[PDB]
Structure formats: structure tokens, C-alpha cells
Design a binder for this molecule. Sequence first.
Ligand SMILES: [Zn+2]
Ligand SMILES: [Zn+2]
Lengths: 656, 656
Amino acid sequence: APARPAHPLDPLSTAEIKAATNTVKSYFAGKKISFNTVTLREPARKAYIQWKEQGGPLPPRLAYYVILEAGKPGVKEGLVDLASLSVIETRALETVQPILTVEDLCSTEEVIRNDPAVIEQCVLSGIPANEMHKVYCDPWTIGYDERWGTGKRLQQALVYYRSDEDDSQYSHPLDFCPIVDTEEKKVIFIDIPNRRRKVSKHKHANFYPKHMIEKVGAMRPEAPPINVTQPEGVSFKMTGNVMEWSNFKFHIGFNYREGIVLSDVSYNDHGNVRPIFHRISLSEMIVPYGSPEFPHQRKHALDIGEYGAGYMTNPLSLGCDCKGVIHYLDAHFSDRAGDPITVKNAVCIHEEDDGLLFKHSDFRDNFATSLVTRATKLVVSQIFTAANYEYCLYWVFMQDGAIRLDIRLTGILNTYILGDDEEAGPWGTRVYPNVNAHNHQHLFSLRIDPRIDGDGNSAAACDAKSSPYPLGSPENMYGNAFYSEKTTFKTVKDSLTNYESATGRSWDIFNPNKVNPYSGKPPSYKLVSTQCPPLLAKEGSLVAKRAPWASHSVNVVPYKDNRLYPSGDHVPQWSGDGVRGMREWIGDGSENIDNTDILFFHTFGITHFPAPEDFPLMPAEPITLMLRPRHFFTENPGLDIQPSYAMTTSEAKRAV
Amino acid sequence: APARPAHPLDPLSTAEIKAATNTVKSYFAGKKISFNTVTLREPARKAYIQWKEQGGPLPPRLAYYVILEAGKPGVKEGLVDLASLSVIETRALETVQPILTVEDLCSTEEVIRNDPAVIEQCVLSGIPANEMHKVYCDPWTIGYDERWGTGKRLQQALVYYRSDEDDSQYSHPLDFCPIVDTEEKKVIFIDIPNRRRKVSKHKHANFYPKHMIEKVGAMRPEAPPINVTQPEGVSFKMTGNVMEWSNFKFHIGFNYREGIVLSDVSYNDHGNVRPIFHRISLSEMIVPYGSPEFPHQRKHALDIGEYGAGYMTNPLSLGCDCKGVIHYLDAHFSDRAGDPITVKNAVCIHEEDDGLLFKHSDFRDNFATSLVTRATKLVVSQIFTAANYEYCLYWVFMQDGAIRLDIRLTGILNTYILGDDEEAGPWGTRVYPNVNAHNHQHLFSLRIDPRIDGDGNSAAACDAKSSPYPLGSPENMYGNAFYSEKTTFKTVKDSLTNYESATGRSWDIFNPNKVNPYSGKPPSYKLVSTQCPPLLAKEGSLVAKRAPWASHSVNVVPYKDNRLYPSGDHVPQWSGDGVRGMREWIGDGSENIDNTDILFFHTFGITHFPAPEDFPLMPAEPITLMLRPRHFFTENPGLDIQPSYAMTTSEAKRAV
Ligand SMILES: [Zn+2]
Ligand SMILES: [Zn+2]
């Protein structure tokens, strides 16, 4: 039996992973099985909390596994109790398909390169059979194809051409789409368009220095350096995966799917350690493309559920992605064979200056009376690559007690071929000759398990509204009166709400069992999110059905153990029909969500209309949302931070 | 005659100011006059452009002045031609009141302190007559009071109490509001509430270290330092007021009213110097409070037009407001006597790291193939104080060609007294015992004079929309189709539009006389603004009438010289009745704004619902909007920037 971790929420160590896989291999003795997922099965919320603050028993270390068996359809999943090295729970799901690992994907390219039918298509497209080594493809989930359901594990290959291995293939997509059987490693069908478009005869749109030197005249001269040094160390303190900074204390976890997982978040309010969130993370996402033409409906990847923000994460060291005195965390997964794999520097932690926290000067002595305090922020981040795109995720903690999620989208646009005399139409943009970048949205589902100042929470929408009384009335004589209308969700159905520019809507997550001694309102953390696009895909569409959580900016359901993934546990190839995930949690919409243990799922993101500026490599596009304490504290929580400058009125006078 | 400036758009030098005032004093020989405003009268748009790019004549240096004459009502304004030292234009406006200078304000406090009636009120409120030196007040424009119109120049004093000079008076407001005659320096009336509330007997809510040490236990220990050094200098180049950075070239101007004014903005697109904006700045603002009770309707200050972001600007040196290798600019105004006054380090310019500009790695060789380029941003900023509040303004230029306006709101909440058994009701929040922070909005009017890739521009609203075709139709089989609906404004009336969350609305400012050779769309800069609150004050209200521009997120009118200030040139005490400012520019809404010289006024800001966290000193609240190039360039404009890391596929292979 492997050693227990330091903390119940720590990810499975490599030893625990081996232990888990050995256990499963034994249980299925004499069966050819392969490992798709071996990850920590977190303790029940209750167990964790009791252990943490009621002297409760240590929760057992459990490992969740997903495997495939040669010749058997679908998958098998279960739990391994590491202490006793045994399978304690197991079941077979023959009509489902699992997340696609790098091994499942890193091999599709070679199979299409060697497929006679694919070769014939390349030849017809203008690439001779002896140049197949110049043909490339990004292996995608087939998403969903009614021609096969989950009856076969499939991938669809978006084909591209490289004139030279160092080229960026995206300026040269081919017009067809092979469909590959993941287990059989072979092409079973190829979607061929009615209107054929042969390879672009243009130069590739490249972005490395040597390419740029040839493209524009030369590179710009290296700019004078901007050095950031922390000579005396950092203010934060890492103890294992536990972080302590500016009164915040939380556990930094990580898994193959969600990537970073922040847990057991609390704030030390001058000795009174107050809980804020039990768990927070990105639980899923979907990038629905808007071209109605076949087979483009199959482009609506749920990167988190179908590839995994953990599995695709970039080793952060080299890129100079994290500037300053960094603290890194590695990630551990399992490979197909059940052996632990490690991706180094998967998460980086650092703190950086963030301008002014607050300031105020008295005009009376010409601002000689003044106090200025600079702000510093705690950043916990990762960068993962979903084939063409790169998602930079930054969890930010601030000195006023706010928590923010900043995402920067970069990488390369998904592209499809465009005929010389073809208009990108209303569905896409011609960002380069013969290149069509299709419209699409980038949507994310933020999962918040709150514990605002303790247990028993509620949620509400807050809308700014003018007084109902008219101009000239005794109640609103000059018609300037306005207030905040708070609608607290009593039932799940009440929470299904969207962002509203008309009222500057924001959402409150509060503890109705307490009151702020000054304001009289319950302590709360307010979600201030504005990049909340409506789901453009029609109701009842493929996209709307497989991502039921995306239809509303906010979804609030009662807490239940293991309610993590909004689009179900096994996303690839699910048609979206059925009661699972968010659709299951919502139920008939009648369960109570007022003053209980609740789960708050927020949908945010952007609607991406490509433009030449995004090609051939896109400048980082920002996305952000934040949670601010409101009525949580009785006053600015950062006033005990040493001002960077401070002069009292009496001091200014005596100073001459 | 004073020496000409280096650049036609430079602010009046101190010598030019003296010259202007001497000239005016002479013209009004034998009259007791005082100077309210002496500032640069910028050259006509045409003149400037012709001079700049057509070998046109140098525009004459002109100074705009506003003066008062003892015994005469209203003001007198005109122009002085500096070259010939003479008044070339002049007129009297007897029914208007001008912007309130620091001199006009710094004296009201003493007049109320010595007023018998005010003293009586203080005594009734619980402050003995011999402690008047402990009574303070923030001198405000009366805003607008139907009892006096513009017939008298008035101020209203928000009264406060300090138990000790080093206290922050805002925890102790008194219940009455004296009304002072600015020219006569005397109290002419006092608004007294029906329900009296005597001074708070609570301790002041203070925020200096000594106060905090007494309040909480002690200050936190100074955190390890975070040093930012630029050992080899900066990449930007300042030539007078002209800035050159990352291909951007623009003129940094500054005046008593708008504060920072960025002009003649262009981008060097590999030798092709392309115009973007002719002028950009904050042209006005309004902070309407939402308590209907008298006399709170008078709280809707237009800080820019009634006090001036220039006049109230903070000398940036000391506070450690600008971190790193800074470049400063001083500001020059005139005092009542016509002598030049200087506020040092009014504007600071610096560049700082801004994370990743872009990145992409190829999963094929496990991300060994990768390119990462860090971003650096150019920041031009100022901080001004409007009595209780501080506004931090940051004009940001980025390496992808985007321009952004970041504002951080800090300082102190406006407060009114609250009775022991009085509820802050729906109009405010009790942020401290006996303290009521009224609801209110912070609204700004961004003024953009575009020249997108040249002359002749248009504007349009862009809305994301689902295909009108239904799910299951040949046109939209799977119902995922969506596009961008562009409504280009033909007439002024068409432009009166608001932000719409339902369509993720954004606005385009484009040049309809050109096309992007790849996308086929006109080059443009897209306004991406989301903090666009609707004006809560009722239609026909005091607030709605004096700030006609605030009713819509966007206002587009034809260009005319001297169309700067949306609420008129002389804002204090204007009732809002009349055809001036934006109401005049809009006219009957029928003038053409399609492919001409246009002016784009954007309303953005926040709706502030106070909470204890904001008191006694508020943590900086963010506000931002940006203008991105879309179809302006033919590809990512920052690709010729040296990557901070780059490894080619062929390089990765040979690297072993
Ligand atoms: Zn995109
Ligand atoms: Zn405010």
C-alpha cells in the first residue's frame, strides 16, 4: 500500500497511480485492458469538512479509473481503495466513449497518411502520393456523428498541408475529412465535399523570425529589458500544495481534466478564519463553430471533457511564461499501460505588482495629506494546448479579498479551405488567400462550490432598477432614485438566468444565516461577470443538447457528491439525449437551493469573429470574471497593509 | 510675443499664458477682471492636417480665455492671437456660470465656519460654537437649483466633522447643507432637513497606520520587495510631447478640463504610416446619486466640466503612483490673477510588462516546437481628486495595435448622515454606524475623433445573431449557424444606441473607402466596451437633461470645430434646458454621418452600490474599454517582435 499524502486533497502520487493500476490489472486478471484515466476520487464534501474542522476520521484515499478492454465496447470504470489495494466499486458502460488521451490521438496522423483512400483524396487535391509526409492533421473527437453514435470510438481528422516541416500548416487545409476508428487504428469513411477545392498554391503564412525576416524586412531590435527581481523572497508560503498569502489559505490541486482545482479556500479575518469556497474550477467548455455546412457541425469541441486541460497542459518552464520568482507544481497521470507519467512545471505560482490598491489625498493642504498603498496579486496558472489553440489560465487572488479568473486566448485559428472565387460568406472570414476562419464561440463553465462564511448558502441575481415612482412624484421628485433589486433563487428553475446589460446584472452567493453588523445584509461574494455571451446555437441543436449548461449564464443546483462535469462523465460521442450532467442535476427544476449546500455553475466566454489580425498567430485575447466580497467584511480588509507613502495632516503641517 | 511651441498641439507655455492674460487685461483696461480659464484653443482639424501632411501653413497659436468682471453677471470669453498679442474674438455670456477653480473653492470652508446661521446649525447638531475649527466641508457646485438658476454663482457645502485634524471626516457628516455665493463669499441659504440628526458620537473610521494599529492589533509586516528595473533604458522615445513606441506615434497634450488629450495617433505599418485617431479623450462625466430626498438631487457632479480633470490633477511624483523608469510631463494653467501656475508631474509615462502577446506549440513533438513572445504595454496616465474621490486614468497602448482606457476608482465614498434608528433604505447603504453611502453611478463620455486609415469614416453596431433559418432546415440543418449583423449608421439618429448583452454588441469605426485585401471588409477599429450602464435617472430628469450624452452608450455626430464638451461649454448651474452641447450636435437627428468627418462619443462607467468594503477608504474598482484593430492589418502586427523563446520543428529534431 502506498504512503498517504500530506493532505486528503493532494493529487495521486506516482506511487499511488502504479498501485491503482496494479490493483486493477489484478482484478481483471487475464484480460487485455488499457488505462484511459487514473485520477484521485476526492473525499465526500462532508467527510472532508468533518476531518478538517470536527476532528473527523481521515477520508480513505480513493482512485478513480477508466479502462478499455480489447474486444469489449465502451469502457469500464470503478474505484480502488489504495489503503487495502483493492477494487471497491466497478461497472461497465458499453454505450459510452471516454476522454481522448495523447496516446489515443498521437497516432491518427500516421494512419491517415497510410490510408489508400486518404491518399487518393490527397492526390485529387493536388498533392502527389509520394509527398504524403507533407500531409498533416489535427486529431479531433468526432464530437458527434449520427451515422455511428457511440457504437465505435471515432476521431475526425482535420487535414492540412506543409510545404516544409517548419511551416504553420493552418494556411493550407485540404477539403476532405477522414473519419478514424480509434481502437482499430483505421479510416472507416471520408467526408468529401460536393465542391472540391485543391490545395492552396500560395506561400504558407508563417511566423518564426526567419520567416518574418523573409516576409517583412527584418525583426525589430530586441527592446531594452524590463527586469523583475524579488531580492528578499516572496510573501506567500507553500506547504505542500497548501498556499498561504495575504490572509488567504487554500489547497492547490490538479487533475487530468479540469487542470487546476482550488479547494478549501478561506480568509484570515484578523484571527477569525472564514471559509469562502470549498471548491472552484473550470468544469467544462465548448467551442461551437457557426458554419452550417457539412461536416462543420462536428466542430464544437468540449476541450475539458474530451481532451482534458490537465492532459494537454504545457510544461511552463522554458517559454518564459511565468516571470519572476516562481514556485512550480508538476502533474502526474497514467499512460495506457498503467505507468505514471509526469508533466513538469504544469502549474506556476508567483506574485506580482498590480498597481494601486487604494489612495486618497486631502485637497485642503494641496494633497500633502495623503496615503497610497500599492497592490500585489497572487497568480496561480497553467497553459494548455488544444491542437491549434492555446488557453492561458490565471487564477488571481487580490488584497481586497477578491478572486479573479483571467483567461488569455492565443494560438492559431481553426481554418478550413476556401475556393479562389468563394466568399467566406456570413459564416467565416477570409484571413488569408484560400483560408476561411469560421465564426465560433469560446464558452466556459465555472464550477463554484461555495461556503460563504460557513455552511448553508443561497444565490441571487441583483438588478439595478429605477424607482417605480415617476418623475415629479413626492416619492421621486427629480426622478433620480434607483436601487438594487435582489431576486434570491428559491428553486433550481429560478436560478436559470443570463447576464443582462439592461440592469447591469450581477449574482450574489451569500450566507443567509448571518448578517453584516453594519449594513444589515448577509455576507457574500458577488460574481461580476460581463463576458457572458448567449448561446447562439439553436435550442434543440447538437451544441445545445451536449452542453445543456451553456444555455444560461448561471445554473444553480443542489450539492451532491460527484457532481463535477456538466456535460456528463463521458462526453465524446454523446448525442446530448438523456438525463445526465447538468440536465440531470436540474431535474424538473423544483429542488430547493435556498440555504443549503449548493453548486453554482457560471457560463462565460466570447463570440469570436475572426479577422486578419488573428492570423497566422493570434494576439492574446482577454476574458475575465471576478468574485468580490460585499458585506463580507466590515471595512476595507487591506488597511493594515503598510502604505507605500503616508503623510498625516498634522505631519504635513509640522513638516513645514 | 511669446516663442512658438515646438508642435501646434502643445499646451500653452507659461510665457504664452502670461502673454494671453496681459493682452486681456489690456483690452479690458480699467476694469476689475479675474481669470477663470486660459488654455490653448487648438487649430481647426483641417488646418492641422493640411499643415501636417500637405505643406500647409502653420496654424496661429490661439489662447481661449474665460474671465469674470466684478459687478457683471456671468462671464466673458474670447480668443487671443498670441503672435500679435491681441484679442481677436470676444463676447459676454451673462446667463451662464463657469468651471469652479481651486481658488473659487478653497475659501468656502472658511466662509461657512464664520457664518452665524451655519454656526447655529452646528450648535443644534451638537457641536459647540467654540469648536467650529473642527467643522469641515467639501465645496461642491450647487449642480442645479431651480431657486436661483444661473442668476448667482453658487456652491453647496457638504458639511463634515473631525474630532481631530488627522481624522477622515467622512464618518461624520452633519445633516444640513449651506448654500454659498461664490463671488460674495457668503452664505445665502441653508437647506435644513425636517428630521434632524445630530453628529455621530462614534469614533471616526480612520485609515492611517497609527489609526489601524489602534483599531486592529498592528500593521502587517512590510512584504518582501518586488523591484522593477530597466537597466538599458526604455523602448519609447519622447520628442517634446510627441511619443513614439512600438510603431505608434502620437501627441500627448493636456488641459485644465479633460486632463490628458491624445492627438494625431498613427501606426507605422512597415513604412506605411497609417492614421488611426485625430483626437481621443474624456470629454465629460457625471456621477448621479440615487436618493430622491431633498437636497440630494443636487448630487450629480460633472467633474470634468465643473471642476476639471486638469485642475484637480495630482502631482504624481511622491505617491509611488508610477513604478519604474518614468517620463513625466508638467501642467500649466492660469490663476485668478492671470499668472501661470504649474502642477509638476501631472502626467507620467512608462512601459511595463503585460504577460504574453502570443504563443503556440505543436503537440506532435510534445511542444518542443514552440514560439512565445511576451507583451509590453505603453501607459500614459494621471490621477485627479474630486474632493472625496480619486480617479486614476490610464491610457494604454499595446503591441497588437489595440488602445485601451483603464480607470481605477478609489478614494472615499460620498456620505450623508444616518439616524440611529434610520434605514439607509433602498437608496443607500449603512457602511458604518450613522453613515449612509447613497447609491450612484459613475458615467464617462469618451470622445473619439477618428481618422481610420485616413479621412472619410463611418460607424456601425455589430450584433451576433443566429441564422434566421430554423433547426432542421437545409440552410441550418443542425441549428448552429450564426453571423455578425452590421448596422452602419447613416444618420445621427441611427447611432443613438446602447450596449446589448443579448447580441454581445460592439461598435465599428471604419473607413468605407478602403478594403482589407484578404477579408474584403473595410479597415476598422472596434470598440469593445461592456461596462456600459443605462442611465437610471428618468427621462426628463435633472440628470438626463444636463447630461444628454449619457442616455446612450454611443452618440455619433458630424465633426465641427470646437465640438468638445457634450454638456455645453459652461456647465455649472445649467438647467439642462436648451439646445447646446450634444443636444445641439444631434439636432433633429437627420444629418449624415456615413463617410464624412464624424465624432464618436461613448458613454461607459459603473453603477456603484456601496458596501462596507468600500469604507472608510475604498479599494480600487476597475473600469475599462478598448479599441482593437479589425481588418485594419493583414496579419498579426506583432510577429516581427523578437520571440522570448522559439524552437522550430527542424530545430527541435536536430537538438536531439
Ligand atoms: Zn477563436
Ligand atoms: Zn462611487
